[PDB]
Swiss-Prot record, chain B:
Compartments where located: Periplasm
Part of the full-length chain shown: 33 to 107 of 553
Record gene name: nir
Identification of the protein by name: Cytochrome c-552
Annotated positions binding heme 2: 31, 34-35
Homology family: Belongs to the cytochrome c-552 family.
Length: 520, 75, 520, 74
């Protein structure tokens, strides 16, 4: 049974914690719930840690007093198809292999499933660790509670005796690096300096051996990613987001200075040996748009290349941990701003960006966002009870599962079937344009080998490669983004029409150049 | 927002509660969750109650940390 | 009304039948239930048949005393989509036409449906008899009971006056031959010598006119394919299976000598004029793995070619009726062992195997097979009744229709939705790898015309054709096998990754050779 | 067996932290957790049928007891 410790004794040294804890809704919650600090208190000084106290990062540390939120969080949505490859005719991107050739995602890119699995799914996907990690058997794939209890209770490592990234099966890749983990877990929150910079007090950084890092991590999406454990107040912990909003001064809503002021973020920094070490961003309001934008954004979390000279940008560079914090029409400029691209296309040779799930930046400027609606309104609404204490659902999932609480409460004029029909109209129209964009991208890509072999000039191939950048960006944003246009249908339509225009321009350029070579 | 009271000071006069509270699974649950004893502490001795402290009997006193049991109960 | 005959009179000549009938559970079942032998008894001698007795092969011969099993067998699963072409984006093999070009399956290859239809479906598929046979009208496609009563009660022949295989519609083929029928019916069990060899006492053989043979056959999957009618004991009748297990000494479980001994097969041969004529294999146990492997195996049942010299192997050769009885990683060696391949690819010219539904050989070595689970446990389980005499369901179908009896009885830790989710995880992952394998196969295939036309050498094209054999085998096994990886997910993953590796090797070879020609 | 085993059993979850239901009510609303976990030989309809046999027989004797008490009282 837990015995409380004297918090006033901690507060003698920990004035920042005192200021947060004594004022918020956890003022009665004793430190012993999350920390074992006996030897720490015996040996610390006002500026030196002494023995390191133990800090619980497991979600069950909160489940004792918040069982409803925990139980809602760990639910598995079985209707969210697991391990479903996007590069197939029946999923999001039928021509993905041709279009993404040259990038690690060609090895496997499945649709998302329930949050309980994020860390185990990261560890087992074919593109991440060379096939090194697997579920202990194929039955464990169902075990959401198990994954939450800890990744290593449900996974095996093919070679515990080595820590190098290598292929264990032929069609895998080793794309994982330490930055990825920041959007899967925050178990390393005390062992990682802000941005993953080298730091005397950090065990792990952008340049760590990712296999060794992986082995130290256990829990997905920790409750304290959105909730400060000391004040219980709303916050973010993700360094890339704090860097965009605060360090770069872009604000929580870059398109809306007023909303950014009303719904802002305060950076709080914690030190080690009186040097800055880690940071959090306390939110003015419980704003899920900004909480979910810790992960559901377009980012860099990988090495790449410079647009200016083609040279390598490695994990050691700050650019390997970066939130662009730009919508699709500002992205090219944001990538030029840091002089960066992701890969060269295997067939066309074009420098190309790789886009990832940009839900937050897509939502900006939409009719719902402009009306003050936020991700949680549609994806984790208040529970409705005939008799009971209301709490917030923490099962983040499609609003189709709770249409009464997620849509129909605001849209009193619709039945459930009408609301679903409105969503499907947008998704159907958007998907048709994604398919047409891929058709035109593929037609262009297929012309590159023909043009090269016919003796078309580098100058023409380079012009086509510049078009390929834009054709790719204005398409891939939408296969990466998970709403199939719902979050911003006018933007998806304008962007996909731009992709098609760019491909058609490139096809015409290449066909004319090939025909001229043949005519000579 | 609740502010914790000094439970040790209570225990200087409440040995019977001390022996139950310090030992069970509510050892970390501060008395402020269920009692308002400010004026009591100002006026009491070990042999004189002074001002009567307030004790909460409402089931919501438990529902803050035990919402699932409370919600199942009130169905 | 049936009148019993004196069996002791038959037994005077038929000592093998006596030894089986008097000892088993049909010892009280009179011969008149299945045989009309009056004139036979008047005219036979101890070694000459005399007048041939009539033998009932219809399934209603058993339905009189076993109505529950019969009625369960003939059920039509309407959720098993009928006439559903596999070569489409929404079915098993989106790029099948490109990959199988040169083979008869390109004309039509539908998904399987309920067993009642096997013989009629064989007769009407576009690749089999040139479109000669059709259902009497499009309504008869629903009539499972009708098909069971007899194929010719529900089909028409476009030209009863000729018996040649020819095209009646332009996009059909005439791939059917007498060996096919052995996995559709055993109505010919007394008219077909072991292996379909020429034999004085056999009306039909591998070299018969298949249209004439077809016309003599009526019933699908006769009850006596798995059950000896005389002893009622478990058996197989399929010659190709007996030949693999017994004649070639490979055993019922080639990877497990112990299980092969415990769950073995005894070949029993019946003679005509004191020469061997036909055979059955009595099973030591009622082992559905071996019963279902009468048909759900990879086989040859067709002419083809020799790998050594390219020469024709016709229906007259024993190789035209052959069970390889090898898993996917032993198949190439098994095909080399008989010096055989199926077709030359129409675009690449490569010698290629054609794979067919290898469920039995895929199941070997799987976690379920190694734990003593058999096909019937998942596909035809015991019926569960609140009050009643238990019997075995004979409706062979997906376990999704009876999850309580097929999975959840052994997997007490799962709900139905969890079990379904585990199946879908495997099928989704496997299908993604099948699609990627086809993508890489198609990329290779498309390079052959480019390479030929650029003047690439025969030596390089031949190296690529050798790679095409392996790329094809390691892919096609999985579009042929019906579980989409469920029966052996680790094997499917390893094989499909091998297919992709082989295609990538071939693509690289061809691209480099084309580029070198262009550079000259 | 105790009252809670039939009237406020542990909740069964595919994924989650187990807690005790505090909705004290007839086991007919949660037969999987209140009866069928101990009576593996029964379906839900069989277990309900066993309950009803007892209640039907008992209620018949209650009604007959009242008939005779009423005849005496009159
Ligand atoms: C002064 C003598 C201290 C007392 C009393 C306590 N702590 Fe402490 N702690 C102290 C220092 C100098 C540091 C390093 C960081 C800094 O502010 O300079 C810490 C660190 C912690 C941490 C972080 C540990 C990690 O893994 O990084 C925790 C969780 C922590 N301390 C908790 C804590 C608690 C619960 C105490 C009361 C029981 C406590 N500390 C006393 C200095 C001092
Ligand atoms: C019991 C000992 C607790 C543990 C362990 C945790 N929390 Fe808590 N929390 C607790 C109480 C008594 C309250 C106040 C209830 C009230 O409404 O007055 C809270 C409140 C929260 C809130 C709401 C904060 C707000 O609205 O300003 C959040 C978001 C919260 N708690 C989160 C949380 C997390 C993430 C924990 C694990 C790190 C956690 N709590 C532990 C009691 C207890
Ligand atoms: C990084 C730590 C994340 C934060 C914060 C949020 N999400 Fe998320 N989400 C994340 C990952 C890595 C995944 C995929 C997990 C996997 O194993 O595949 C997801 C998934 C979703 C989904 C899909 C759920 C399903 O049924 O398929 C939704 C609807 C979703 N995420 C929404 C969401 C919302 C609304 C958030 C703020 C409250 C949020 N996520 C935060 C990573 C992270
Ligand atoms: C936050 C900025 C993220 C970083 C850095 C990484 N990932 Fe991620 N991931 C993120 C979200 C919000 C989601 C769900 C939405 C979606 O479109 O998938 C995911 C999902 C995954 C998955 C499951 C789906 C899949 O692609 O197969 C895997 C396997 C995954 N992520 C792996 C991964 C790796 C290897 C990363 C570093 C290269 C990486 N992620 C970074 C959010 C973020
Ligand atoms: C960000 C992606 C979140 C994570 C991770 C967790 N929670 Fe949360 N929580 C979130 C939001 C947007 C809200 C609603 C705030 C609003 O005012 O609209 C909540 C709320 C809470 C509360 C308060 C009571 C309630 O409304 O339910 C508690 C006690 C709470 N959350 C606890 C909690 C726990 C235990 C978590 C880990 C399982 C958890 N939260 C994760 C956003 C996020
Ligand atoms: C209601 C007005 C919404 C707001 C605000 C947000 N999203 Fe959404 N999202 C919405 C719909 C109608 C859909 C399609 C769901 C369907 O079943 O067709 C989505 C989709 C997602 C997804 C994928 C979910 C899935 O299909 O499993 C994700 C990951 C998602 N949305 C995330 C998300 C985030 C992070 C948001 C705030 C920035 C957000 N959504 C806002 C409806 C609404
Ligand atoms: C000896 C005079 C016989 C008596 C009495 C019966 N049968 Fe016979 N039968 C006999 C011979 C020599 C043969 C040829 C096969 C052989 O063992 O050498 C047969 C064949 C049959 C068959 C197979 C017919 C076919 O189509 O191939 C059947 C089904 C059969 N016999 C049945 C049978 C029954 C039911 C009898 C009693 C009524 C019976 N036979 C008597 C020799 C003799
Ligand atoms: C009635 C006159 C029967 C006809 C016609 C058929 N069978 Fe039969 N069968 C019959 C009885 C009385 C029994 C024994 C019942 C018992 O359990 O004691 C059987 C048994 C079988 C069995 C079980 C055999 C075993 O478990 O060893 C099978 C597989 C069986 N019967 C199959 C069968 C088939 C395929 C028939 C048509 C060729 C058939 N039977 C006819 C009664 C009668
Ligand atoms: C050859 C005589 C067969 C034996 C013995 C078994 N099966 Fe079969 N099966 C066979 C064919 C020719 C077909 C396709 C029929 C058609 O008209 O398309 C099938 C089909 C199945 C299916 C699919 C059923 C559906 O609903 O789609 C299953 C699940 C199946 N077969 C399983 C099965 C099992 C478990 C067997 C041993 C008990 C078995 N089959 C024997 C040919 C033959
Ligand atoms: C046993 C070794 C078989 C031989 C010889 C033949 N077939 Fe077959 N067939 C077999 C099974 C187990 C199944 C169901 C499983 C599957 O993957 O389909 C089938 C199915 C058919 C079907 C229906 C499905 C289809 O491909 O359209 C047809 C039309 C069919 N089979 C025809 C056929 C022909 C023409 C054959 C000789 C060339 C042939 N089969 C042989 C088992 C066996
Ligand atoms: C192989 C593909 C089979 C065909 C064709 C038929 N049956 Fe069958 N039968 C089969 C199995 C695997 C079993 C179970 C054996 C075990 O012990 O697990 C059965 C069982 C019977 C029985 C016994 C009673 C029972 O368990 O139901 C009977 C009477 C029986 N089968 C009859 C029967 C009839 C009439 C068939 C044609 C419609 C029939 N079987 C086909 C395998 C196979
Ligand atoms: C349970 C452990 C199984 C055993 C043993 C066998 N099979 Fe199976 N099969 C299984 C599953 C879960 C599936 C996928 C079904 C789904 O609905 O997703 C299958 C599939 C088949 C099929 C195709 C069925 C269909 O989808 O209509 C066939 C033809 C089939 N399996 C045959 C088969 C044979 C012959 C087996 C013994 C060698 C066998 N299966 C074992 C589950 C199980
Ligand atoms: C399972 C073995 C039981 C135990 C232990 C207890 N009770 Fe029960 N109770 C049980 C049944 C099957 C029924 C009939 C319910 C029906 O729907 O037919 C009851 C009934 C009650 C009732 C009336 C409930 C109602 O019909 O709404 C009460 C108030 C009740 N039981 C209380 C109770 C108490 C206090 C127990 C412990 C002393 C107790 N029950 C034990 C099944 C079981
Ligand atoms: C007697 C009639 C009870 C009343 C009034 C309350 N609860 Fe209860 N509780 C009861 C039992 C029989 C049990 C299970 C004991 C066992 O171990 O089998 C419980 C359990 C709890 C727990 C522990 C966690 C759990 O098992 O769910 C908690 C936190 C709890 N109960 C809280 C609770 C609250 C908040 C109540 C008022 C709404 C409440 N209980 C009333 C019996 C009784
Ligand atoms: O790839 N090395 O972490
Ligand atoms: O793969 N995660 O963006
Ligand atoms: O094709 N002649 O049977
Ligand atoms: O087409 N039958 O394998
Ligand atoms: Ca999903
Ligand atoms: Ca990116
Ligand atoms: Ca089918
Ligand atoms: Ca074959």
């Amino acid at each position: 049974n837990l015995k409380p410790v004297d918090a006033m004794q901690c507060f003698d040294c920990h004035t920042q914690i005192e200021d947060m804890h004594t004022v918020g809704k956890h003022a009665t919650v004793n430190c012993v719930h999350c920390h074992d600090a006996t030897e720490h208190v015996e040996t610390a000084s006002s500026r030196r840690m002494g023995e390191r106290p133990v800090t619980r990062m497991d979600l069950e540390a909160c489940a004792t007093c918040h069982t409803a939120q925990f139980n809602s969080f760990v639910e598995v949505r079985h209707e969210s198809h697991p391990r479903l490859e996007k590069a197939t005719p029946t999923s999001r991107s039928p021509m993905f292999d041709k279009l993404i050739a040259g990038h690690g995602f060609a090895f496997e890119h499945a649709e998302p499933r329930s949050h309980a699995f994020m860390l185990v799914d990261h560890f087992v996907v074919d593109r991440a660790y060379g096939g090194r990690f697997q579920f202990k058997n194929w039955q464990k794939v169902t075990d959401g509670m198990g994954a939450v209890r800890g990744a290593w209770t449900v996974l095996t490592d093919a070679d515990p005796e080595s820590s190098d990234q290598r292929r264990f099966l032929s069609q895998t890749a080793t794309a994982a690096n330490p930055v990825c983990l920041n959007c899967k877990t925050q178990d390393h929150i005390l062992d990682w300096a802000y941005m993953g910079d080298e730091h005397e007090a950090a065990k792990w950084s952008r340049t760590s051996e990712v296999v060794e890092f992986a082995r130290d991590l256990n829990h997905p999406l920790n409750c304290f990613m959105c909730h400060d454990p000391h004040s219980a107040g709303p916050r973010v912990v993700r360094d890339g987001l704090i860097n965009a909003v605060v360090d770069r001064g872009l604000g929580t809503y870059p398109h809306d200075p007023v909303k950014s002021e009303q719904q802002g973020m305060t950076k709080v920094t914690f030190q080690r040996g009186r040097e800055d070490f880690r940071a959090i961003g306390l939110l003015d309001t419980a704003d899920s748009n900004v909480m979910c934008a810790q992960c559901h954004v377009e980012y860099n979390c990988n090495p790449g290349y410079q647009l200016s000279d083609g040279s390598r940008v490695g994990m050691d560079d700050r650019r390997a941990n970066h939130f662009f914090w730009a919508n699709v029409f500002d992205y090219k400029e944001a990538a030029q701003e840091i002089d960066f691209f992701d890969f060269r296309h295997a067939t066309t040779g074009a420098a190309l960006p790789k886009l990832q799930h940009p839900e937050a930046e897509t939502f900006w400027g939409s009719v719902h966002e402009r009306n003050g609606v936020a991700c949680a309104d549609c994806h984790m609404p208040k529970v409705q009870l005939e008799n009971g204490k209301v709490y917030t659902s923490h099962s983040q999932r499609t609003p189709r599962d709770m249409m009464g609480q997620a849509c129909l409460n605001c849209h009193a004029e619709w039945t459930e079937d009408q609301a679903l029909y409105a969503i499907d109209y947008i998704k159907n129209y958007t998907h048709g344009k994604i398919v047409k964009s891929e058709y035109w991208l593929a037609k262009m890509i297929d012309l590159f080998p023909v043009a090269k072999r016919a003796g078309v000039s580098e100058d023409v191939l380079n012009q086509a490669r510049e078009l390929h950048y834009d054709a790719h960006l204005y398409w891939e944003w939408w296969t990466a983004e998970n709403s199939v246009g719902f979050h911003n249908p006018d933007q998806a339509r304008e962007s996909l029409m731009t992709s098609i225009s760019k491909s058609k321009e490139a096809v015409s350029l290449l066909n004319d150049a090939i025909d001229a070579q043949v005519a000579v």
